[PDB]
Structure formats: C-alpha cells, structure tokens
Design a protein around this ligand. Sequence first.
Ligand code: MG
Ligand code: MG
Ligand code: MG
Ligand code: MG
Ligand code: MG
Lengths: 755, 756
Amino acid sequence: QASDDYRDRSLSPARRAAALANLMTLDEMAAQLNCPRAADVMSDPAGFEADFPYFAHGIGGVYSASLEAGPEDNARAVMAMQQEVVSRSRFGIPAFVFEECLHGLLADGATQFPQAMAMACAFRPDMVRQVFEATAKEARSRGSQGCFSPNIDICTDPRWGRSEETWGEDPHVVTVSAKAIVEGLQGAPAEYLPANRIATSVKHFAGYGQGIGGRNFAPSHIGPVEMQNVVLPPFRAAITEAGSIGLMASHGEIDGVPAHADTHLLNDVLRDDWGFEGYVVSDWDDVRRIHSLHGVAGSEAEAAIMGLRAGVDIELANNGVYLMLPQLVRDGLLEERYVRRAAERILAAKFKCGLFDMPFADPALAGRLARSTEHKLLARRMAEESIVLLQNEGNVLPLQSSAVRKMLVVGPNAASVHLGGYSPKPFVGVSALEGLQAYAEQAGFEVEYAQGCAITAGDEGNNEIETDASDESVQADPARNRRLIAEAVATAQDCDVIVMCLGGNESTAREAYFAGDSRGDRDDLELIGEQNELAEALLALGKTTVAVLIHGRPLSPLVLAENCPAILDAFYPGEQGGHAIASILFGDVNPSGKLPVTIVRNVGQLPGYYYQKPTGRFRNYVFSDSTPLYPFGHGLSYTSFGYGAPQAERASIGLQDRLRVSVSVRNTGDRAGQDVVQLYIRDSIASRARPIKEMRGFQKVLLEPGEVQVVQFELGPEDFGYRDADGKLLVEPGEIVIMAGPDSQNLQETRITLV
Amino acid sequence: NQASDDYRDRSLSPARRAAALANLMTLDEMAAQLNCPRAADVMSDPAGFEADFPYFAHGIGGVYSASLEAGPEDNARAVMAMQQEVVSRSRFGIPAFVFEECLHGLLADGATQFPQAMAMACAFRPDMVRQVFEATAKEARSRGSQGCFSPNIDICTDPRWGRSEETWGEDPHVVTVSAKAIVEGLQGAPAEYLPANRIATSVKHFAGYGQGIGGRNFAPSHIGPVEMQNVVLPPFRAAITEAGSIGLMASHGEIDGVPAHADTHLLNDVLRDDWGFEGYVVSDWDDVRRIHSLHGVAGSEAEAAIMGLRAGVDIELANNGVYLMLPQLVRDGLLEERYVRRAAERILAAKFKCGLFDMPFADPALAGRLARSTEHKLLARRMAEESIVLLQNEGNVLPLQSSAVRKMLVVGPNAASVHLGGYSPKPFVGVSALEGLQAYAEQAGFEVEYAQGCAITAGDEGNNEIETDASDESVQADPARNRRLIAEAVATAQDCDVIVMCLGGNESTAREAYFAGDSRGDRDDLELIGEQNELAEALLALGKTTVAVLIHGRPLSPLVLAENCPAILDAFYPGEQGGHAIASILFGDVNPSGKLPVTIVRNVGQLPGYYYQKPTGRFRNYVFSDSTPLYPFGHGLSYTSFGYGAPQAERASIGLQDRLRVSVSVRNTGDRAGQDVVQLYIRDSIASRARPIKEMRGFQKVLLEPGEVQVVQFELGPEDFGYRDADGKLLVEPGEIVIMAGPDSQNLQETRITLV
Ligand SMILES: [Mg+2]
Ligand SMILES: [Mg+2]
Ligand SMILES: [Mg+2]
Ligand SMILES: [Mg+2]
Ligand SMILES: [Mg+2]
C-alpha cells in the first residue's frame, strides 16, 4: 500500500483511489462531491468556474449531458466537455457523465424499449439483461459511464405516478429484475467494468414507492422487518450479488427520518451489513431538502453536514449545499475525514469504470449502435414477450386476418406513440395504428382511423411533432369528446372489427416534480375521462371488438372488464410496440405476459398486493366484491396449459438444506405457446406473522401442442426463512407449504417440514 | 407490603390486600381468576358450567355481558344470583368481575343511549363527556356491572373502517382529552378505591387498532416507534398514568408481524415499566388463541396461552379459552408459576379497588330509578344539541322559521327509524328525526308528512321500534324499488314548502366486521351508499326550501350532497333524544356548535387525509382532482359569526422547560348568541425528526352574546412543544415554534416564539 501508484492500471480501483486521494488537497477532493446539470458546464466552462470556483479543480459528475444532441453530436459534445474538466484537474480526473437508462437511454435517437413495468410482464430476465446490455452500449459510446437506473422500488400503491418505473409489487420479481438490469448495464461482477458498460445507481433507497396516499414525496410507514423482507431485498441483491457501483437515496422520510439523513440505512445497513464500496448519490437537490422540505436540518449548512455524515457521497444538484463543505471543514464545523471518505468512493468508482484509462466517447460507434437493426428487433421481441392477455371471453382473439374486411382503429392512444416517463421527446416509434396499417397492407384488409376521444387536451392524432414542453397538461374537454365519440360511432358503422386503444398517458401518470404544483398521482384507478363512454358506445354496435390498454400505472378498468370480451394490456410497449400488438392481435405471436402487480377492483380497496399477512385481507368490504380484478401473476394464452402438483424431492429437510421442487406443465391446446410457471411458499408458523404466500421462483416455458415438460426449482434457507429487524436470516423448524401454478390463485400445493 | 397485611382489612390498599390474599391461594385458585367467558352459560347453569370447566370450582375471573335481554331490576337480580354462585365456590368469597359495554351508555335493555362516541367528539365539551359517563357508570354499577370494555381510544385515521364511529376522531389531543374525561366519569377522579356507583374502565384497543391497512378490520397496522409514541399512545398514556384507568384491552392486530396480544414491548416495557401500570390487561375476544389460529405466530394453543401470559395479558376474554391450560402447563413444567401469580394478583387488586369484596353485588331498585331517568334523558338531549355540526349553510337557509312553515316533508332512509350506532341495545329506543319534527310541528302550528324516499338496506324501512333478529345477514336495498320510492316522495313533495332529507348510513353499512364467517362492515367508498344521492337530487330539483340531516356511523364524504344541497347538518348518531335536538337546531332554538373531529376527504382515493400531515404528507396533489379536504378538521358553522384575533404569547422567548401563556380574542360579530370552539395548534419548525405542519394542543368552547368579546387563555409547556423519541423520552429542542389559533384547522392566525 506504501508502493501503491494511481497510474498503475494493474492495481484495484480502491487502491488507485486511495493512492490518488493521498495526493489531493481538501478543495480538490471536495470538488469530486458535486454533480450539477451538465448544460451550463458544457456551454461556458470558464463562466461556470467563475460562478462556482470549485470547478478550478474538476468536478464529481454532471447530469444529462445528452441535451438535444443525436448520437454522434452527443459523443463529441461530451469529449469537448471532458477535455475542459480534465484540463482543470492536476491529475486529469474526468467527470462522471450521468444519464437516465430506465428503459433505454434517455437521449435523442436512442432505442426506446418497453417501459420497466411492461418488461416486468414478460418474466424473461434473460431478455432484460440483453435490453440493458444494449442500453449500456448506446450510453457508453455517447460518453455516459453511469446512470441513475434501475428503479427497484416496490409498487404497492398504483396511485403513485411513478409506478410504471418499477418492476411491480413482488420482491422476488423486483429482485431478479434488479440483478438482470445491473448485470446488463455493468456487465457481470468484476474488478473493472468491461468496455461499453456503465455504472448503475439503484434507486430509490429505500421505501420510496410506499408513500402514503400514493402521493409523490409523501412519508412511508415501513416497519423494520417489512423493510428487510419487502423493500430491501432488491437492493441487497443489486449491491451484494450483482455489484452495482452506485446507489441513489429517496426523497421521502420514514418515521420522521429523511432517507438522505438516514444513518441506519445509508451506513449501518448499506456499508456495514452489506459491505457496499461504491458511491451514494443524492436525488435532485435532496440534501438541501433535509432543511428546506423535511425541516430536520436547521440550515443549508447543517443539511450538507447531515447528509455527508449519514453517507451521501455526491450531491446531485445545481448550486448544491455541498459547495459549502470546504469552508465548513476550514471553519471547524465538519471533520475533513468525511470529505475524504466520500471523495475516495467517487474516485474508486471512476477508476473501476475506466475513466482514467479510456477515451471519453466514440462518436462513430455511437452512430452505428443507436436504434440499430439488432436493437430495434430486441425492442420488438421484448414487447411480444410482455403484452398481457387479460381476458378473452369466447375466444374473440386471435383475429383471423383472412376474415377481416375493414378495421376501425380508434381511441386516444391509437395514433400516438406512448413510451412512458424518462423517454426522449418527441417520442419516436410505431403507434398501434401504424402497426395495424402495416399489417393490413400485407394481409389485404382496410384500416380506418378515428380519434374516439382525447385523454388530455391537445394530445390528439399524431405524436411525431414535439408537443409544447413546459406547458401544463389539461384534461380533455368532455363536450368535444362526446362529439368525437359520435364521429367514431358513425365511422364504425361499416367496420367489421373495432380495435380500441385506451388507458392513460404520460400526463395522467407521471412523476410529480418538486416545483410549483406539479401533479402525477391519481385518486382513482378507472380509465380517466370519457374513454368508458366511448368503449360502451362502440361495443353497443355488436361488432367484433377488442381493447388494447396503453398506460403507465396499473389501471383498474372495471367498466371495460365487464363489457369488453377481449383485452390486451400493453402498458407502454416501446418504440416497436405497434408491430407487436398487431402480431399478437392476429395470433402470429401467442401472448405470454403475466401481470407483475395485483389489479384491485377500485382504489378504495388499496392495498391489494398479493402477499398479505393472514389478517391483511381477512375481512371484505360491505356490499362490494373484494376479490382482485386480476391477481398477481395473471395472464392468458391462445392455448391452454395443464399443471401437475408440485413435487418436493424430500418431505423433510434440515434448517440449512436446499430442496428441489418440480412441476409438470403440458400444452393442452391447439397452438404453441409460453406459460410462466410460478412457485410460491407459505411459512405456516413463524416467530413473526408472514404472508399467506410469497413468490420464490418462476420459469417461462415454450411448449408445442401436446408437449409436456418438468420444470425444476431449487429453494434454500434464504427462501424458507425471513430476516429479522437487524437483517439476520431466521430459519425455524416447522411446516412450509409449497405452491405452484400459472398465477397466484390457480395453485396446487405440497407440504414439507423443516427440522 | 408487610407480613401483618390482612386481605380482610378494608383500611389497607387494594394492592396490599391482593398480595395478602394471593399468598393464601393455590395454583388452581389463582389460575381461575384469569378466565372471563361469556356470562350466559355460567348464569343459566352454574353446576353444568363447573362440570364442563372444572376451574369454576374455585370461582372465576370475570364474565362478559350478563345483562342479556333483562331490564334494569331483573338485570341486577340476575347478577346477584350469579355472584352468589360464584362467591359460594371461592374459598375466600372472591366475586366475579361483571364486564359490560359502555361505549355511549350502558349496552343493556332500558339503559340511556347517549350520542355515539364520534358524535360526542363533535361537541368539544369534555365537561359534559365526564357527566355522560358518570351517568353511564351509575346505571352500570346499579345493575351489577363493575367493569367495562370502554372507552375505545383508537385513532381514526382511516374512515373506511367500520368501527370509526366508536372513536373520538383523528386528533391525538382530542382523543387524549376525551379519554381522560371518560375514565374520570366512569371511574371517578383517581383514588385508592373507586367511589360507590363507579366502574372500572378497560381502555382499548392497545395499540394502533385504528390504523389497519385498507380500513379493513383485523388488518395489520404500519406504525413506526416515533409515530406510535406521538400519535397512537398519548391517549393510552393519559388514561393510564393520569386518569388511573384500572384496566386495558389489547388489539386484534399486528404491527410488523407482532400480534399486539403477544407484544412484550407494548404490554410490558411501555405499559408496565415506562408507565407504571398496576391494573389488568384483558384480551379482546378470543384473541389469545388467535396468536396461533389467526396470526400463525404461536405453534399451538398451549404456546399461545404462554406467549400471551408472558407478554403481559392477565385475563383472557374467551369461551373455553386457552388460559384454561395454564395450571396443567405449570404442573407439566412448561410455564413458571410466577406468571400465573403476577396475573392473578393484578386481577385481585383491581377487584379490591372496585369494592367487590366490601359491597353488595347490585341494587335492583336504584337500577330502576336510574335507567333512562329524566335527568339522564335530558343530558342525552343536551349532548346532542352540543354535538350536531352545521357543515354548510349556503344563503342562510337555516334556521327555518316555525311560524313561516306550513307543510314540511320529512323524507329519507334515516327519518322514521332511530339510529344509535354500534354497541347499543336492540331494538333501538329513542326519538327519530321524524318523531322529533312531528312533536315540534304540533307545538308550532304546521303540518308534517313523511316519505321513505329510499332504503339503504333491504327490510330496513319505516320505524325502528319492533324487534328483528341479527341472524339475517344484511342485504343492500333494491335499486328499482328505491326508484319507485323516489318517485313517490317527489309526488308527496309537490305540496310541501320545506323538505328535510334524512340521509347517511346505518348500523349495517358501518359496523364491526366480526371474526366468524364473512362478516363485513368496512367500505371501499365514502359517498352516500346506494340511491340516496339520486333521491336528494330529485327533491332538490323541485326548488323548494331543502335541507339535509346526515345520520351515520363513519365519517362520510357526501360530495354530490355538498355540491347541490345548500344546508347540511351532520348528526352522526345523535343518541336517543336526537330527534328533538335536530328539530331544535333546524328552527333556531339551539344555535349549532358542533365541530368536526376528523378531516373529511373528498373521496376515498385521497386517503389518508388527517390534518396533522408531515411537511411531505400532502406536499403533492392529485392530477385533475381537487385535493383539498371537503371539510377540514375542526370545521363547524353557526347561525351567528365570530371574529378572531391573532394568538398572543406572553413572551417572545422562553426556556426549554418553561410554560407559556397564550391568549386569543374571539368576538360574536353577528346578531344572536352562539358558541364557537377556539382552537390552538403548534408547528415545531425544525426538529430532530420531521414533525407535522400543525398539531392541536388546546381548545375551548365559548358562549358569546351578540357583540360580546372573550379573551380565551391557553397555557403550553414542554409536553406540548417537544415530542417523544422512539423510547418515549420527551425531547425539547431549541428553536422556533409557530403558535396558531382560529375556529378550525384552516382558518388560523399565528405568532412565533423561540425556545432557548
Ligand atoms: Mg392513468
Ligand atoms: Mg415456520
Ligand atoms: Mg410494537
Ligand atoms: Mg356508511
Ligand atoms: Mg424545533
């Protein structure tokens, strides 16, 4: 360690970081803890230094350097900025260049895969890794070596406008997805990142999705055992198994403790229990908000101090409160060892991502990868694996294209592309209307379009031209909608097939920003506005009619589910989604998605997530069907599947043993198809009450007609036990019920005993 | 505690008499004091009961619900006979605790039915609350009951909960103030022994029962330790450590996987060690067994008994309970006898304190004089007059003028029926809205007609006087029949110049969802159920003078009615004299002065909406939806008007341990006398843990003549300005406190002080 040299590429990132940090002044180390927006650094670095003198020593990171630039211009703009940063540091430390990679890179010209919750419907973690390996390549070639993704929050409240960012309600699903995403973006765990990979910052640590009322920023009520067995597991796997380099903290509070000042979470759990060696980044301006919003720090200075000592390493903010850290050290108010501790984490991450050893970006590579043929094909395939068949009464689907003459494609989400939050605007891709038009051209039937109704005012017809940004969204006028509905009814008279494209859009489910009176959470889970009136008016014509749901949050479409026989749930299907919808509507693709959330019947029945305690849904609501509209794991096929009971290899095992379980699944229908075999356990008696069922595995299987297969699962003590308030795994003797089936309701079971 | 202590010495303290007695008792005799089955089988056949349950050879801890279907004198005599059977079996003559329900009066045939608990919370008259429960205790003790499973001091944060009406609202200060007045009314002011004609309280449900997710009865609550210390516990802490509640009952539910009936931290560390409780912990009905059979935490019934007893449950409320295994478990070596002795001694000390050893069992003739006495009926009338809330009075439709009315239509599902709420004797006995208005018309010289309007539940139409069984599960009223009933009321209304709509919910749409079968009582919607809005809009379209009176259990969010009907009274369940109090307020003889003790959200999708949000709790609003409350906490109008000055603190800066005087002037700026509730709130601007944007710390109902001014005085201190950490330690921190005052939680002026 005495001989350690930071210029030695054969040394580990942590040892190069320590050797470099020993050469640095207080001001140089403190500059590494700032991450403003890139825009003002890129446009006038000399003026940025004038306004923010720390920039004489370089910078920790910048956020969103893509700006409005296409792939090659983005790469060149980052190279130019990096040269400005590296020229200011005595040691040539480049900036981290942070972007969003929720479902593809948030940058002009980049491939837009289906939204996270859409992809969660696929139950194909292998394809999730591919999607984010492709995202990483696009990001890194354009100069970004880190991102503020994945969102591995748990969606327990679909009122939340950010639900679409999550992989659903289930800890197992969110955990498996977390690992696939981190390995996709970073590569498999290694001392150094492979080339063409980027650092992840798993967010938001921890409990952000449990905000009361589904209101963004609102406190979460999470007990310590609930924290350990529901909310933390995806983070623990992302950190301790897949090796995520970064982590982002949560806006919110738990029991009065803001996450950005939560030493128990940010230090005791993350550093001591889990051994995290990467960086903790704040969410936007959330260190200041320990004071300005939560009222826990008495000033900006004290907020800076609380966040740093709690364990936040780098502040994502313009003119952040971390700009005060050098003077607070020099004034005696803050121990310099906390500046050094954070800067050493940042530096080791920068070494591990190759910043010191590699070019800044690769403009020509960036141009080849962006929306490449291979990446668009992947986005199409992901959508084909994700779309969920909710119901198909009377086998209306698949449509037979030879028997179609004139199809009406109608609805607020027919002609527009819908990509979800964190997508480059304007949206680029294949709307449902365009997918069906292109399919009709090949198949030889006619397609007619009608608006039907609007969801938000001004969002009608095409989505190709960039809609007025920063303009506040307004609900669509009901009177105009009823005239649009009558127009659609009239146009439908000579159509033999109606395809209604309904749901929500990026204005009715969205992140409610801190500024002003920004809104994005809903107090109702039905289809908003006049869409139900539209669907009823079309369904009354007695035509062959189906619905395709395009939307962000999980929706509870009761009127539609009651009156429309066939419903496809596509969430946001990505830039190739329209082709995938057409292929599924006509049975060229057999739908195979399953719901990664429970769909409750109405918002007054929340919470409805499937892993309730024995008392959680013990009592039902008066005069009201209290069953879910669709249970977790639900999804139909154009074929049928028969299941045998789960078979354990032994009837009894020791507290530390593993156990093999097998399930026989057979295609009992007419068409090749995929089903998702799902494995659940119940810990019958426990030292703390446990859910009535908890998913511990799943497996999507392709089966030809009449084909039968034995699907194998392996469970261990990490599956049969639970973690206590301190994170220690308890395995206790007694009965475990083991359940398997095609969803969380149609289960068969066997029982084993732990001894 | 001395060796000379003698359990027969009435000059000794209850605790010392209980120790002296316990030293004389066997394991089996002490264990028998830990059982509390339902009274009926003990009373009907005591020899058969002892045959079925051998511990009864040594007496019994308690019985539950001995009133049965008997009136006051027969009640008192039936308990005397049963107590003689009990006392004759105990080697030492230990009588039974006789536990009844006293939620809003004694749940027994012929007892005075006061307004429901949430209704009475609207009155902001804790002095009258104390009187109401003094009257209730008299009626209970004279009939042989010396303990009750009351008050319910849960916090109503989720109005979907079918038991909302049993609580005193959402605010910790209000529920704390109410809890102390109830305990001091039922038990008397804290004393070594209960005075005559008082009974023991068992404050329930410990702790967090109201926070069950989904508003679903029995469902887990998610409560952090600081929230628990500053929201849920303060009423229990005040009841236990200040008012001296002798008993306490635990909760059905779990927090973070820990059943409350097995929560050693709650039942021992906080209740025994931190607070110094010396009374008894009684289980809720069969909840010790359910540690095993519902929660899945105990591996067996024997393990459940052990968990409950060691956690700190002293007496099991159950038939054929798991505590019947306690003697054999001690003898088998699976349980230390000292836990049986710890529990039985608490029970015995409570019995001494309640005078069971030194008093007659009951008093049949006094029981007959007290039951629904003229003084108690008048108190029930006056309480309703103080509780009914004027929600809105657009254009000053109220008060009606009696001399100006000719023909009034009284219409709606809650007009002709009496509604008293859960935990009331059936069939209900009282003055319905219709009857109250008919009697007012007779004296006033105008006509009244009645129409059903619509039904809420099928078979519940017309008056509520003749008895029907509770074994017919309730079904919702038929919409087509209701539409015909709406048309009929429309026709009847054509000749009426005034329409009074009696709407809301009933004891079937808000009720306790019981354990057995598929019992239901919680709602996933807060609007008026069924066709009541249809009925209301049909009558409003006629253009006559129309007012609405709301009669219901849970807080309701009647958006349609709030938008379309200009004058709304909220009566909750106004007790057995409620019909008269409603009529008196409709015509101006009483100026309404109730205030809401909960926040009323616009719709169930905006829950939670309780006012004391953290700064982030309602930081963001719902897309395309008015996210303000429909009515804020503390809201209530008047037939006069009140002008408020700003709160004035006596000092701008005080020390951490100082008390502070604050005054608020209020002036009657209208033309008739009336009451208002002056309300004080604080905000701790900066705190080591984030605190609510405002927290009620005082209130005072005032009565003012036209033009009269009063300067209301409040005093605040460390317990008001600070907050309790996760261990219960009061933290007071230097820095700014905002002090706010006004007639409700939204119409406030403020001043700022500094703690140094
Ligand atoms: Mg929506
Ligand atoms: Mg077990
Ligand atoms: Mg607890
Ligand atoms: Mg109701
Ligand atoms: Mg303070």
